[PDB]
Amino acid sequence: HHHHFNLPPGNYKKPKLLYCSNGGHFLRILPDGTVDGTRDRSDQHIQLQLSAESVGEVYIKSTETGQYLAMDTDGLLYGSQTPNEEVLFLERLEENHYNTYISKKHAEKNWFVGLKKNGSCKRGPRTHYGQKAILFLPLPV
């Protein structure tokens, strides 16, 4: 248990758009398993449904394709067809306002879900507390 337990409010009743305040991109999981960000609100692959496993743990799934957001052994985000240990994330409040997501499998290395200003995903090892890339706001679809 190497992380704080400040949790964000809100629930998982409805789907959300995960808006990254770093560049204004929405997290996107493409049909081919590619993960990135896009500023296009009309995109059909940015609608995500979150749900809890244990308290503070979440699954982040594409409502369009049914894939799971997942982070691999090298810290790369990818869309997984099935749930495995790489699809669980620790959802936490950050800066008393945002939501951050730490890879459960690699929680000890502080690997976060993050988007760069150019819309490309940050690789696990390149993320850390304090960056704007890891700060998300769940917005209504």
UniProtKB/Swiss-Prot annotation:
Cell compartment(s), UniProt = Secreted; Cytoplasm; Cytoplasm, Cell cortex; Cytoplasm, Cytosol
Q: Which GO terms describe its cellular component?
A: cell cortex; cytoplasm; cytosol; extracellular matrix; extracellular region; extracellular space; nucleoplasm; nucleus
Span(s) of short sequence motif Nuclear localization signal: 13-16
- Binding sites annotated in the UniProt record for heparin: 22
In the record, biological process GO terms are: activation of protein kinase B activity; anatomical structure morphogenesis; angiogenesis; branch elongation involved in ureteric bud branching; cellular response to heat; epithelial cell proliferation; fibroblast growth factor receptor signaling pathway; lung development
Spell out the molecular function terms from Gene Ontology. Answer: fibroblast growth factor receptor binding; growth factor activity; heparin binding; integrin binding; S100 protein binding
Protein name (database record): Fibroblast growth factor 1
Task: Give the source lineage, highest ranks first.
Answer: Eukaryota, Metazoa, Chordata, Craniata, Vertebrata
